[PDB]
Amino acid sequence: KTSSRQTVFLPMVGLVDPDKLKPNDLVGVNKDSYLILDTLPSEFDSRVKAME
Amino acid sequence: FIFSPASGIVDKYIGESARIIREMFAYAKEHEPCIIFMDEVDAIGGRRFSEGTSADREIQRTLMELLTQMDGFDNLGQTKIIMATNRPDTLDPALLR
Amino acid sequence: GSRRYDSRTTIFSPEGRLYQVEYALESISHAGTAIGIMASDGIVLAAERKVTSTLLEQDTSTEKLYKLNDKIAVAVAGLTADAEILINTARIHAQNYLKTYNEDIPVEILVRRLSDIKQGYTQHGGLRPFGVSFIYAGYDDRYGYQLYTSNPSGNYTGWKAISVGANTSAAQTLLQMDYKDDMKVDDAIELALKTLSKTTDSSALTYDRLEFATIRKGANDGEVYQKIFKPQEIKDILVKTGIT
Amino acid sequence: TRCKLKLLRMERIKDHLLLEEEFVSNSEILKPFEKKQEEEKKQLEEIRGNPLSIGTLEEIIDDDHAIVTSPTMPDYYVSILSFVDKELLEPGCSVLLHHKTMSIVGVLQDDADPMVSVMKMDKSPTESYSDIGGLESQIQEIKESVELPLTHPELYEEMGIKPPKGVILYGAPGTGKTLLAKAVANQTSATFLRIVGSELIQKYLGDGPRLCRQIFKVAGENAPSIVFIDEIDAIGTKRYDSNSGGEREIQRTMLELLNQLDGFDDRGDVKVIMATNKIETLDPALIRPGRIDRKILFENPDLSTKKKILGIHTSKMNLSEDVNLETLVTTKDDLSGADIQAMCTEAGLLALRERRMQVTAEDFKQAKERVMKNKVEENLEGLYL
Amino acid sequence: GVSTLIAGFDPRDDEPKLYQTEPSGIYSSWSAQTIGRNSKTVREFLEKNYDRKEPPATVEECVKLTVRSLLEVVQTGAKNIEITVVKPDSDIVALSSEEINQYVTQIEQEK
Amino acid sequence: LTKQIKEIKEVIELPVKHPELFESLGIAQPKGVILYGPPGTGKTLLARAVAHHTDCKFIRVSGAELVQKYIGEGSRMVRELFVMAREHAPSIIFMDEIDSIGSTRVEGSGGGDSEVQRTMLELLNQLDGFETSKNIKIIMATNRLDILDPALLRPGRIDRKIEFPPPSVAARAEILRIHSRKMNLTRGINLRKVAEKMNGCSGADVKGVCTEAGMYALRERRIHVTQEDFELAVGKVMNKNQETAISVAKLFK
Amino acid sequence: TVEEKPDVTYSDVGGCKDQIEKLREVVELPLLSPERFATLGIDPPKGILLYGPPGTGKTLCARAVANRTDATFIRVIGSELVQKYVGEGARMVRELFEMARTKKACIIFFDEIDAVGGARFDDGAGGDNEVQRTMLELITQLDGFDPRGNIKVMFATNRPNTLDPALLRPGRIDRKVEFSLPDLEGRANIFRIHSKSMSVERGIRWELISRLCPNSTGAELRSVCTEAGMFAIRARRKVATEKDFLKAVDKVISGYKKFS
Amino acid sequence: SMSVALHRHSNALVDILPPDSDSSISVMGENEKPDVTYADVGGLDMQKQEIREAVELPLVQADLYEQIGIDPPRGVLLYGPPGTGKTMLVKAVANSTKAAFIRVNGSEFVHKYLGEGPRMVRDVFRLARENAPSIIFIDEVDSIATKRFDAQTGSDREVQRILIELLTQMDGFDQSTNVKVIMATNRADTLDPALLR
Numbered sequence A: 001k002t003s004s005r006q007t008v009f010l011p012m013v014g015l016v017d018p019d020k021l022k023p024n025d026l027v028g029v030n031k032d033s034y035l036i037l038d039t040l041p042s043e044f045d046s047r048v049k050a051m052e
Numbered sequence B: 001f002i003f004s005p006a007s008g009i010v011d012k013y014i015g016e017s018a019r020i021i022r023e024m025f026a027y028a029k030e031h032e033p034c035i036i037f038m039d040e041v042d043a044i045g046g047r048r049f050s051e052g053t054s055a056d057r058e059i060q061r062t063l064m065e066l067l068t069q070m071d072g073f074d075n076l077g078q079t080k081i082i083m084a085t086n087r088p089d090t091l092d093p094a095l096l097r
Numbered sequence C: 001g002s003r004r005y006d007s008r009t010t011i012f013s014p015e016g017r018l019y020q021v022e023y024a025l026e027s028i029s030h031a032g033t034a035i036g037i038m039a040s041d042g043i044v045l046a047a048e049r050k051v052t053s054t055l056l057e058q059d060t061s062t063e064k065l066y067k068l069n070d071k072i073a074v075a076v077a078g079l080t081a082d083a084e085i086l087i088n089t090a091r092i093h094a095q096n097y098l099k100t101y102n103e104d105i106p107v108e109i110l111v112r113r114l115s116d117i118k119q120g121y122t123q124h125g126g127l128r129p130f131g132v133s134f135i136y137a138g139y140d141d142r143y144g145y146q147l148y149t150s151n152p153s154g155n156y157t158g159w160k161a162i163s164v165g166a167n168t169s170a171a172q173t174l175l176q177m178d179y180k181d182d183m184k185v186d187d188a189i190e191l192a193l194k195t196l197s198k199t200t201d202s203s204a205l206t207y208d209r210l211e212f213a214t215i216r217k218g219a220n221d222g223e224v225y226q227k228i229f230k231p232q233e234i235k236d237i238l239v240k241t242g243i244t
Numbered sequence D: 001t002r003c004k005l006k007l008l009r010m011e012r013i014k015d016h017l018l019l020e021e022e023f024v025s026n027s028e029i030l031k032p033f034e035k036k037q038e039e040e041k042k043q044l045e046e047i048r049g050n051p052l053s054i055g056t057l058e059e060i061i062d063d064d065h066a067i068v069t070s071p072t073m074p075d076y077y078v079s080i081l082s083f084v085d086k087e088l089l090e091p092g093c094s095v096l097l098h099h100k101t102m103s104i105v106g107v108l109q110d111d112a113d114p115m116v117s118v119m120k121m122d123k124s125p126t127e128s129y130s131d132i133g134g135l136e137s138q139i140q141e142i143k144e145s146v147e148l149p150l151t152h153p154e155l156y157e158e159m160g161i162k163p164p165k166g167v168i169l170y171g172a173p174g175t176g177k178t179l180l181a182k183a184v185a186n187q188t189s190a191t192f193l194r195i196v197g198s199e200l201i202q203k204y205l206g207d208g209p210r211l212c213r214q215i216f217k218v219a220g221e222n223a224p225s226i227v228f229i230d231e232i233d234a235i236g237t238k239r240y241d242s243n244s245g246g247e248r249e250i251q252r253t254m255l256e257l258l259n260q261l262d263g264f265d266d267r268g269d270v271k272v273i274m275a276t277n278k279i280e281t282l283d284p285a286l287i288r289p290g291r292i293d294r295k296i297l298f299e300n301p302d303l304s305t306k307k308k309i310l311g312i313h314t315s316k317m318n319l320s321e322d323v324n325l326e327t328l329v330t331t332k333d334d335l336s337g338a339d340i341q342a343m344c345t346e347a348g349l350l351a352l353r354e355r356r357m358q359v360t361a362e363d364f365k366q367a368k369e370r371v372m373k374n375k376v377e378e379n380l381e382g383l384y385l
Numbered sequence E: 001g002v003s004t005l006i007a008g009f010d011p012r013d014d015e016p017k018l019y020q021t022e023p024s025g026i027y028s029s030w031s032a033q034t035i036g037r038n039s040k041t042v043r044e045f046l047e048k049n050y051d052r053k054e055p056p057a058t059v060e061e062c063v064k065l066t067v068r069s070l071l072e073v074v075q076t077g078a079k080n081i082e083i084t085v086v087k088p089d090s091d092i093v094a095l096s097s098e099e100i101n102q103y104v105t106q107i108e109q110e111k
Numbered sequence F: 001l002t003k004q005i006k007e008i009k010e011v012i013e014l015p016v017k018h019p020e021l022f023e024s025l026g027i028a029q030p031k032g033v034i035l036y037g038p039p040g041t042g043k044t045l046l047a048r049a050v051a052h053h054t055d056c057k058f059i060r061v062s063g064a065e066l067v068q069k070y071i072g073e074g075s076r077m078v079r080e081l082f083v084m085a086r087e088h089a090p091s092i093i094f095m096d097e098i099d100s101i102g103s104t105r106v107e108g109s110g111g112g113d114s115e116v117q118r119t120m121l122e123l124l125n126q127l128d129g130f131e132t133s134k135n136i137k138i139i140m141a142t143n144r145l146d147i148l149d150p151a152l153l154r155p156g157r158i159d160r161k162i163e164f165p166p167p168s169v170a171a172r173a174e175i176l177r178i179h180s181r182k183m184n185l186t187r188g189i190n191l192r193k194v195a196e197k198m199n200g201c202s203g204a205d206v207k208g209v210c211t212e213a214g215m216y217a218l219r220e221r222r223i224h225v226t227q228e229d230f231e232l233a234v235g236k237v238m239n240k241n242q243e244t245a246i247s248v249a250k251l252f253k
Numbered sequence G: 001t002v003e004e005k006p007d008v009t010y011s012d013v014g015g016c017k018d019q020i021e022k023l024r025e026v027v028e029l030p031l032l033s034p035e036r037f038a039t040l041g042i043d044p045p046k047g048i049l050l051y052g053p054p055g056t057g058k059t060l061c062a063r064a065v066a067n068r069t070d071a072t073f074i075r076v077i078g079s080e081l082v083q084k085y086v087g088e089g090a091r092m093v094r095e096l097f098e099m100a101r102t103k104k105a106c107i108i109f110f111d112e113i114d115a116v117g118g119a120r121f122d123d124g125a126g127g128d129n130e131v132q133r134t135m136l137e138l139i140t141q142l143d144g145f146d147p148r149g150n151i152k153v154m155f156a157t158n159r160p161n162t163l164d165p166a167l168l169r170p171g172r173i174d175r176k177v178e179f180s181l182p183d184l185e186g187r188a189n190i191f192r193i194h195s196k197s198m199s200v201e202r203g204i205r206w207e208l209i210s211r212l213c214p215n216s217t218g219a220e221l222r223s224v225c226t227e228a229g230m231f232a233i234r235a236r237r238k239v240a241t242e243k244d245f246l247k248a249v250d251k252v253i254s255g256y257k258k259f260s
Numbered sequence H: 001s002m003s004v005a006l007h008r009h010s011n012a013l014v015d016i017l018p019p020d021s022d023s024s025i026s027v028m029g030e031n032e033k034p035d036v037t038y039a040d041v042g043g044l045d046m047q048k049q050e051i052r053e054a055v056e057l058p059l060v061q062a063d064l065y066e067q068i069g070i071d072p073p074r075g076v077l078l079y080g081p082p083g084t085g086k087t088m089l090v091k092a093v094a095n096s097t098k099a100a101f102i103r104v105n106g107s108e109f110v111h112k113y114l115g116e117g118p119r120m121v122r123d124v125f126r127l128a129r130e131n132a133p134s135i136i137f138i139d140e141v142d143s144i145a146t147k148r149f150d151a152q153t154g155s156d157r158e159v160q161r162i163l164i165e166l167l168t169q170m171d172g173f174d175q176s177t178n179v180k181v182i183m184a185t186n187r188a189d190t191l192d193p194a195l196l197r
């Protein structure tokens, strides 16, 4: 699901592991044609911070 | 198997609970054999309102949406519900029938 | 303890107004229509029952019309249960006046006494007042025929024509157009029936659901005869006035 | 006849003369376009192009650049260009940006908006004092506050206290506070802006506040001024939905207004008129009691007051020779001027129905009956009897 | 919820007495007073139409002053207007509507 | 609805055709018309009826007007309605909203729906001046005054408060009169039977008899409606009402 | 919004109140003599939460002490400003806090942190949640360099039921004080300052107006004086009497009691 | 005004669509009732007849009704205790009609938006007309209808809006070529005061 508000079905790219790719893994995706380029750490909201 | 608590589906956004069990249901219809575990249904239980607030009327809609999926124009196939309730007295005759 | 379960039932509101009396007027609007019309030869009291059924014996019933004394009868509009207490208080009071002065009670005195009881209950004791409105037909020598309405607060007001209970507004407006001071008991009987046919509490007005009573000075030697008409004597008058 | 002839003389020579002079001048201008002019107009076209997108100037950065916000969702860092400079611009002004490559190429709007058009009015109010007649004591609270420091601020200086600042018209509907605001502002001799606070509510973001800001800028140019923000109650505190909202922008707008009350310099020269149904229809968060000064409390016309109001209405009403004013007043109890207005109109309707030119006293009773109808109270004799 | 105006004479006295009692349990004497609806309005009228120093000299001017005060709020003929006069030492007369009508007409015409 | 027809001709027709006559004999112009009364009285049907003869564009507008969102929100098409209506002159706007907002947002002037409605109303005054007089009628229709919006609330605040009565026996008989032609005329003229037996609170109840009557005729395989077809038909419609009326007519105190 | 040692004393604050002597104890005492605290082994207080009804004069008092104690005064009010928008107000909070700390002998006031440095506002008039970033920054900053060299932190809240528990914990707040609705004689005093500035009657009883009033804030007493001015102008006098203030109190009481 | 096709890259009107398109799906299952017939019923034989008379009969024979002279059958309200199939009653009949059938729910008229909900009920009503005759069954209207009118927060007002629009639209304008909408209810205590009727 892009931050451009689209849902896109991608062929898995050989570069990354299928084990990093989870529900809400933040992912780099190629700007042009859309292919999972890389992985990114998760960001956490201010709601997360107070609690923890 | 979908273990879902029923106090877990409740949101102030109206028809969100009705949306959640409808999708859960559509998933179950595909994923046969499937048992849907509605645990602690007592949370969205009770009956009446319409002098209540629209949160209750949504709980009554959800409770009713349940009612839609089981019997109506949709049916169960090799889908199956188990409902768990911790008090049968919160639980309503429309689901003890 | 005792104060825990009390809510201070009888008190003023910020407007000055007594909660239980306001509530009481609602419950008298549930109860049937009762109309009184004061003619220049009598008083006609005509009431439509709040209950009717084919299994209900209404041919011995006198559930609205009750005689307090020989010259004063009432029609009832409100709770029958509540009214019963005031009815037997009135009988005792009228007989008490007769015992002590050997003279029949004037209509003013009897009404005032009942009114004091109703005020008293909201004043002290935390008691609910009687939720009834009565129309008193009475004769006395001094003021002649006198007509009175009493309300559940405990206040009485004179009239010439008046209605209490259900359809008070509708009955009143018809009376204003038709009433005249040259009316006789004959004319007043016809007016009462017509008004009840336009203020009917279902879709029909019948003899068997009508209670009817007059007090007429047409009895010989200037004496007053209270006649409570049976439903088949009402039926006779129902064909006379052309309701049927 | 001769009063016509003299006006005729003046008005013909001035109009006619002018037409001929304009007609010749359009030619005399266009023939020479040599030297300075041709050069100027040509450069201006080249730097520009077609089409030109509306913009807004948020701020100037002191290096001949600016931060601008477009009607498209993006915002942009642009260069200041052309004949229009940052000295000639000021923040919050609407500016022309060239479509392809965003740069300020000019201005022709000069801070003209469809909100700006509605607010503007520099003419005197329509109502003069006691059109608006009567609620004299109410005028004798608004005038104190609104007319008097503008007229002579001196008075307060000799008194030795801060001038008044704003007024809050609040209390009963149907007393004409929306009319009254007009009446006073005529008398003073000042400019009268009028804007409805419902048009400062926007579903677009950052737009709400821009619209509030335009008001005080305008107000200061044309000072002394009385600004009427009609219905501050309509910003209120309300909510459209709570499951898709709408209740964010309301706050930001309310806030932008509380700040420029005091914050547009401590002056009673930037007066405000806030009409409100009650104070508890507003956001309860409020500025302190003296910052808004006196709160003006409208209440029901008394017996004397509604003779005045009634009298105004019925003079306008034609063919009522069978009506006497007093008898109308006797039967009625205290009521707004609003309902007097309705009764007089319902009485024309009845008499038009009947097909009879005349308007009777009898007629009017029928109109009283209709207005009073569903105000009935039987708990009045519930307490009394 | 009841306040009273108690007035009269004492035996062998021609001094008029006008008192007001209220449901608080307090009472006060007054030269003139008004209670009930629009008591403020009638009272304001009485500030200019009654002097502490000088009451109405005659019975008739007192009667017409009370009719005049009622004709502010009450209005609507002599139907709803009542007047009771008490004169020294047990002389109570009640002035019927006919008497009141005459007084009303005189005030109306004069005004 | 005999009275109602006669009142509303003066209300709707006459300002349109002669705005000056309306002003001369009486005063002012209407700034609105508000229809209210019990359901089923046919107030919606009335506004359609009068508008035919008026010869203007009866647009209607059904329901709430926050419903537009697919080209943009409905939170300013209320306001701008003033403009839209002006363009399509001469035009009659049947902005309907039956009301279910209650008593809650009457207090204050709360609600965002009520604001926008309020804004249109503030606009609404200007129409007597923006192209002179009125020629466009703003006919609002609501069920009651209790459930109403705050801005529309007070008598004559949007002009013209007209209560629609429940129909009389004579009126019920006339409502019946017209449906009889449409159906096959009764044998034995038993039209008065229905009218005497019950009187409704709606023109809908009358209508309910016509349809009910044709269930029984259909079954019997006789087209023509008869007294017997009628007696069954009034008994069916009155059943609904007798049952709730026996519980206060019997077993009461 | 920021100022710099503004000239206000206790003379100009109407009355001396308990809440002023609790301010003296937080603010003056460690600045003047951090010595006595040290020898004692009690920690010097530097945290104060100020809460009460508005218009009590809390703002006058902070400045009063600012002048006395001789410390530069930095006022930030976050719900007055428009700096709140998704952590845009987080920058206001970060920057000014660090700047003030650089300055020696200084007072930092974040005022009206009911929101904008206060609790969530989802259930509120708005549907905001922008406020929780600005709250996030504020929490950290009061532990980043303590002991702060005798720099005092003030906080304004109307209701202290709108302030986050992380904020409420110790070190951030070392004194808690409720501002009290000023007494009748204490209103004679708040009135006295406004009345001395106004050309008035000499021999006026201040105590007569304060008797007539019930408990009213000092802001009200400031409005009443302006109001009396107005009625004085209307009669064409520019010298007021006890009479213009009898009027002025009647206007306010009937006016405000009913609503807000 | 109705839906239509535009080219992707020419951005113009090249082709037309039925208005049926871009509107609610009509039965999300297959349209007809599963093997359950009048044989399986087991009721309620009489009352099922009354449902046939109301729903299928006008649609099959129009001419017959024209003979009686009556307007065609009004909406049906199915109320009673549950385990009466009342829902199955409509499905069984509709099976045998051989006309379009529309299956939207009251729990599908829901929204978390502004006026999006009333807009959904609107697409059904128009859509019924286009694929005429049509049998409209709404499974629930219990908490989509309100006896007491509320508007406590904004979120009470959204439910109310759907009620308003349902009534007004119900109603006849051009007059219905449908059977007039069918609704089912566990009880009528959670319906409106008098607006059903």
Ligand SMILES: Nc1ncnc2c1ncn2[C@@H]1O[C@H](COP(=O)(O)OP(=O)(O)OP(=O)(O)O)[C@@H](O)[C@H]1O
Pocket (backbone or CB within 6 Å): D131, D132, D133, D134, D135, D172, D173, D174, D175, D176, D177, D178, D179, D180, D276, D277, D309, D312, D337, D338, D341
């Ligand atoms: N002083 C007056 N003299 C003449 N007519 C008046 C006067 N006051 C009010 N009216 C009449 O009553 C009408 C109602 O007044 P107006 O529209 O200003 O109400 P409002 O008090 O602002 O109510 P809301 O609470 O709806 O804003 C006026 O349009 C005018 O016709």
Ligand SMILES: Nc1ncnc2c1ncn2[C@@H]1O[C@H](COP(=O)(O)OP(=O)(O)OP(=O)(O)O)[C@@H](O)[C@H]1O
Pocket (backbone or CB within 6 Å): F001, F037, F038, F039, F040, F041, F042, F043, F044, F045, F098, F142, F143, F175, F202, F203, F204, F207, H167, H171, H172, H195
């Ligand atoms: N006077 C009449 N003549 C014939 N049919 C009538 C009449 N009045 C109403 N009806 C019938 O009753 C139906 C319902 O009436 P309608 O929906 O127009 O009512 P309303 O009073 O405007 O209600 P709401 O309160 O729902 O806005 C009509 O469609 C029609 O079939």
Ligand SMILES: Nc1ncnc2c1ncn2[C@@H]1O[C@H](COP(=O)(O)OP(=O)(O)OP(=O)(O)O)[C@@H](O)[C@H]1O
Pocket (backbone or CB within 6 Å): B067, B071, B072, H040, H041, H042, H043, H044, H081, H082, H083, H084, H085, H086, H087, H088, H089, H184, H185, H186
């Ligand atoms: N007449 C019948 N013959 C055969 N089976 C039947 C019959 N009636 C009902 N049943 C069985 O019972 C089930 C329940 O009926 P249905 O789903 O229609 O309930 P309902 O009365 O509409 O309840 P709710 O109040 O939840 O809407 C049916 O699916 C069917 O299996």
Ligand SMILES: Nc1ncnc2c1ncn2[C@@H]1O[C@H](COP(=O)(O)OP(=O)(O)O)[C@@H](O)[C@H]1O
Pocket (backbone or CB within 6 Å): D288, G013, G014, G015, G053, G054, G055, G056, G057, G058, G059, G060, G182, G189, G190, G191, G193, G217, G218, G219, G220, G222
């Ligand atoms: N105690 C007082 N003596 C004098 N004026 C007072 C008093 N209290 C408040 N006021 C007046 O009200 C005004 C506003 O109060 P302010 O200092 O902003 O306070 P707060 O923070 O409590 O809302 C002051 O500037 C002053 O004019």
Ligand SMILES: [Mg+2]
Pocket (backbone or CB within 6 Å): D177, D178
């Ligand atoms: Mg207004």
Ligand SMILES: [Mg+2]
Pocket (backbone or CB within 6 Å): F042, F043, F044, F045
């Ligand atoms: Mg309708």
Ligand SMILES: [Mg+2]
Pocket (backbone or CB within 6 Å): G054, G058, G059, G156
């Ligand atoms: Mg402050």
Ligand SMILES: [Mg+2]
Pocket (backbone or CB within 6 Å): B072, H086, H087, H184
């Ligand atoms: Mg079902």
